[PDB]
Design a protein around this ligand. Sequence first.
Ligand SMILES: Nc1ncnc2c1ncn2[C@@H]1O[C@H](COP(=O)(O)OP(=O)(O)OP(=O)(O)O)[C@@H](O)[C@H]1O
Ligand SMILES: Nc1ncnc2c1ncn2[C@@H]1O[C@H](COP(=O)(O)OP(=O)(O)OP(=O)(O)O)[C@@H](O)[C@H]1O
Ligand SMILES: Nc1ncnc2c1ncn2[C@@H]1O[C@H](COP(=O)(O)O)[C@@H](O)[C@H]1O
Lengths: 102, 304, 73
Amino acid sequence: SMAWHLGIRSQSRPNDIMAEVCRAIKQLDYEWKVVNPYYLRVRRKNPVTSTFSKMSLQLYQVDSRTYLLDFRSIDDEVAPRPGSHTIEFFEMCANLIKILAQ
Amino acid sequence: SNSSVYTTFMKSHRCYDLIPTSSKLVVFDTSLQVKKAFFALVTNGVRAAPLWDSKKQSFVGMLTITDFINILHRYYKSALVQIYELEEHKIETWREVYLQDSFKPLVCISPNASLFDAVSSLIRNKIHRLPVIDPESGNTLYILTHKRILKFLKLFITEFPKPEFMSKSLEELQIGTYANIAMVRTTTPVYVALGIFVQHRVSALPVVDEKGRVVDIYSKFDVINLAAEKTYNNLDVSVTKALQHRSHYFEGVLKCYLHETLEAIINRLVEAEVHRLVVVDEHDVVKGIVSLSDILQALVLTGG
Amino acid sequence: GQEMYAFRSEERFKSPPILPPHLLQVILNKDTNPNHVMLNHLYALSIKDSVMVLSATHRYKKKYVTTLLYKPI
Ligand SMILES: Nc1ncnc2c1ncn2[C@@H]1O[C@H](COP(=O)(O)OP(=O)(O)OP(=O)(O)O)[C@@H](O)[C@H]1O
Ligand SMILES: Nc1ncnc2c1ncn2[C@@H]1O[C@H](COP(=O)(O)OP(=O)(O)OP(=O)(O)O)[C@@H](O)[C@H]1O
Ligand SMILES: Nc1ncnc2c1ncn2[C@@H]1O[C@H](COP(=O)(O)O)[C@@H](O)[C@H]1O
């Protein structure tokens, strides 16, 4: 836990990045809205717990050749069992990345 | 004394009140290889990590140094018989290997629950790591320990309308353990030490000389150091050599006598930031142990 | 009648916005182991040995926890 990087970076065309993330979102059965060409709001229903989690995606330019995809979780509005908003955010990001990138 | 300033303070404070402004939390997916998980504990400077079952979408348990100890002892004995399964186990597979029918569900506490409830849960469940979990989010906010709890009590009661029991000795209050003390010698190999930890369920072992005088302390804390090495083959080395891997000047083992007041013991323990004192006689011979567990159990059942 | 004409914005969303108002691209946490709007944002270590390490800081009332998840790929 030494060098932490914000989101993930890519040298792929920004249009290709956004298009591929949108295809992943739909393949993953998440709902979404296009706020900007580079800013998406996504909503996911937990198929186990029936809860809804929201996050934002924002594409940035970091170089002349390089883009950064940033993920931000959106805050909602004895034993525990099902659910953790924070962990579910990580899994959402992970599923989205796996299903659209590299 | 009784009904206590402590008992009342604990009932009137929430677990939230003891969480630091800022903390870190390491969580493992249960599909994680056990070997990688224990190296992550070291890397992050952390005992205890909540475990997340992705299929179930819930926290299911904790991973602690004790779990590491159980696994190494198993690994060490299995190797002598040419069975090498263990260190390619995922957290999941080892959990089913020991949480067999024997059921140990995750114990947690709400941020809105009292500190009294936290102390009771720790004691009742015979546990050292109590994750504070927000019911609204399901998020683990913090892992509550006896060390943090006692420090908090020392600090925020630090006024003294003082209970009479605070001026009484460990002897008269009967706080601590004074028989069947698990100890090792200078030369005792680490794997022997592991076996003792596994059998006795005890967080540290006084290292004693030929006359039974204490010269060092071998903690479970000192055991995850081994997770940094790539061989695990150095379990045949003595406890002394294993303790060289410590960070800091080891000033000496923190001791006390049976005749010191609870106040003096609480003060020494909180300032030293250690889990126990080794109880000793006039001549450094070990007579017992007074642990954070002993103290908190006494304070919750009203001092001593 | 006459045909009507469309003047279209163009640009603004030619090229993604530049990163840093105050949002840090790299966090170094060596430290021999108070920041604003990095809250709720995903951070990560470089992938190593088929394991992801995802991270973020979230606020509960007045307390902040940085959670790390170690997750096989
Ligand atoms: N909150 C919890 N809920 C359920 N099980 C737990 C919890 N905390 C620990 N355990 C389990 O109980 C056993 C011992 O846990 P404990 O917290 O005492 O270990 P530890 O942190 O190594 O303590 P110490 O080093 O003080 O002996 C381990 O198998 C661990 O997984
Ligand atoms: N009585 C003692 N005298 C000297 N050193 C000690 C004593 N008890 C523990 N230590 C050392 O302090 C370090 C921290 O160990 P400790 O048993 O307090 O584990 P911890 O994780 O800090 O405690 P806790 O489990 O209560 O959070 C260890 O390296 C251990 O050897
Ligand atoms: N080496 C030891 N031998 C015997 N009992 C111990 C030892 N260390 C701790 N204890 C006792 O075991 C209980 C739990 O202590 P701990 O493992 O320190 O949380 C307490 O009552 C301690 O006094």
